[PDB]
Amino acid sequence: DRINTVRGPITISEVGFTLTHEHICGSSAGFLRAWPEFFGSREALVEKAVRGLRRARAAGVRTIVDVSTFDLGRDVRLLAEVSRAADVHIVAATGVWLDPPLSIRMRSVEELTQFFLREIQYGIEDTGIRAGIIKVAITGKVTPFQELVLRAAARASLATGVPVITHTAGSQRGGEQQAAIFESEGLSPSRVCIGHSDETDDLSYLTALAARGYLIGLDRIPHSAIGLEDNASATAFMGSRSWQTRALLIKALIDQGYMKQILVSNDWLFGISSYVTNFMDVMDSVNPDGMAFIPLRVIPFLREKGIPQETLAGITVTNPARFLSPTL
Amino acid sequence: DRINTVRGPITISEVGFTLTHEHICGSSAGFLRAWPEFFGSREALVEKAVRGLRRARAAGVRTIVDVSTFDLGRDVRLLAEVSRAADVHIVAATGVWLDPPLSIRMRSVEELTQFFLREIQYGIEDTGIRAGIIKVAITGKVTPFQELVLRAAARASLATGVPVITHTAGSQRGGEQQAAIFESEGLSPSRVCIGHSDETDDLSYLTALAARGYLIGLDRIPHSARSWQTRALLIKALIDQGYMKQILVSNDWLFGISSYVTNFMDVMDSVNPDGMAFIPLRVIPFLREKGIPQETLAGITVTNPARFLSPTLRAS
Ligand SMILES: [Cl-]
Ligand SMILES: [Cl-]
Ligand SMILES: [Gd+3]
């Protein structure tokens, strides 16, 4: 019914303009607590995230989905502190990303299902903060362990109504292999977002998934290493396609009649330790607008290309609310 | 020169009989906090650890070294609670084991040095508990990343005087690889224990390391599950070569484990019900029956660990 946030449950009407694929910090389990000075200090990270989220709020953002899992270093007390000080809703996540420690990757599908249910139904750690989404990541061809994760995600979603968001690393696609596993578990496509789908220009691929009822996450819009060709780490992380090319996939799916299947986001963050040192400075140099990039740059761009305001409000308000509202 | 424990600094005279390579829990960073029910509950893990440490204390143990690193799920607040309840000193560790997350394995040698120094000089997380040892694990062939870890460990040891303990996973030898890297950095062998050394029968290899000044960690004795007596006889063999001062003995035990198959703890407990008391209850009497004097046993279990753990920036 209602949606669980790091400040507690909110009604669908309170969700508002939502960014569906974000993070406060991209890290590893326990790392922010063990080496906060990697980020300058915990206090500096909080300050930067609060300033950044307040800017996004000024630009109209009301809710973000922090898809950070246990193994991406999710620190729900950090999310709570930042959500409260920025006065922006944050939905927390369960699931498994691409760096599970042994205590996770040795677990069975039944064990993973119980872990996800604990975080959704009881709370994360000892905080009582409950997850409102399940995040899964796969590599190219689904590994045996990643199939266990996808199946446990489907089983937790069916038990709680909470949605699933995915992405594929190092491959421009992946959604068709994921969708096959999800449907083999009886999961409705309307509970699944195929994330980072703006990494490809394969419109046939995107349209076919949308036509099955999947949500299409065009959610890395500002990521572009154009101009940073001499930084190989930036190219591998952000790609060589312009943000306008990513944004025009939004227009293309609208033009095909699938406005209701689109979710949009920046895939931003305010600190990152899981990649090369000081990569946050590289991303900040490419997109000083941070999480405000979507409302400030992409929305007017799509308006200039003729998309009605009503259609954009449906994509940024109505679709995420339908997605996040628990449904089974 | 005092030794840092999870309850603060203690003097050498308080260290007593020490188990130099142990764990309370073998896990992953953040896992005990995120899924305590995997262990039944946090309270159940505490109660089991306290009973196990009280049993070891009644067999004479006064200090354990918990060599669990960040990536093995070290929870220093758990260690502190168990140490207080059982009245057994616990020395905590920094370093890197075999499962570093991206935030660790993307780091440079200079960054890893700073991380170890933070945990030794300032404290672990926000607790003020300082590490008293650096643990490094490697695999058969040292990987490029493992070499960075070994060099960072040497640099942190040289800056603080705390010792380093290492082992090689998947090869009965391998100490030569670490020794060459450590010496290239200027680290004294007297600051280094080559652990899991009871996993080889090649006594010539252990003797050659002992002759270079390394400490020999005969610390997986009950993991035979090869008999434990044959492993324990390596202790007598090294004594008879004249290297009693270079021997450290332990169990490499723990009271919960999540980093392998589910219920592996039950397998472990079935083969060694003595837990951490295996060394004092089985190995020490066995060596005494084989004619090792009391004074030599006390040297190995009291004098050697205190010499090893006492921060020493300059070797004799
Ligand atoms: Cl992610
Ligand atoms: Cl270890
Ligand atoms: Gd061990």
**In angstroms, what separates the C-alpha of B297 from chain A's closest C-alpha?**
38
Ligand 3 centroid, distance to A72 Cα (angstroms):
26
Dihedral of CA B135/B140/B145/B151: which sign? positive
Q: B interface mutation test: which of A23, A27, A28, A71 has the most B CBs within 10 A?
A: A28
> What does this entry list as its resolution, in Å?
1.6
CA A243 to CA A264: how far, in whole Å? 13
| CATH code of residue A266 | 3.20.20.140
What are the tokens at B41?
């509950």
**Closest alpha carbon to A65 in A268, A273, A327, A221:** A268
Element (H, E) at A95: strand A93-96
For the CA of B98, the nearest ligand: 2
For the CA of B99, the nearest ligand: 2
A161 Rama sector, left if φ>0, alpha if ψ -120 to 50, beta otherwise: left
How was it solved? X-ray
CA A5 to CA A64: how far, in whole Å? 10
Ligand 1 centroid, distance to A26 Cα (angstroms):
8
Give the three-class secondary structure for A180: helix
CB contact set of B216 (below 8 Å; sequence gap of 6+) = B193, B194, B197, B206, B209, B210, B238, B243, B246, B247, B248
CA B229 to CA B6: how far, in whole Å? 33
Domain range for residue A208? 2-327
For β-strands B133-139 and B93-96, DSSP reports them as parallel
Element (H, E) at A55: helix A42-58
Q: What residue spans of A122-268 are helical by DSSP H? A: 144-160, 175-184, 203-211, 232-238, 243-255
The CA distances from residue B81 to A127, B26, B58, B101, B245, in Å, are: 21, 17, 19, 27, 33
The CA distances from residue B178 to A134, B165, B186, in Å, are: 42, 10, 13
Interface contact flag, A99 B99, Cβ < 8 Å: no
Ligand 3 centroid, distance to B72 Cα (angstroms):
9
Amino acid (1-letter code) at residue A262? I
CB contact set of B301 (below 8 Å; sequence gap of 6+) = B17, B18, B249, B279, B284
What are the tokens at A151?
């199946």
The CA distances from residue A194 to A22, A150, A176, A197, A210, in Å, are: 15, 12, 9, 6, 9
First to last CA, chain A: 10
CA B15 to CA B65: how far, in whole Å? 11
**In angstroms, what separates the C-alpha of A175 from chain B's closest C-alpha?**
25
User: How many Cβ atoms are within 10 Å of B225's Cβ, its own excluded?
Assistant: 12
Count of domains for chain B: 1
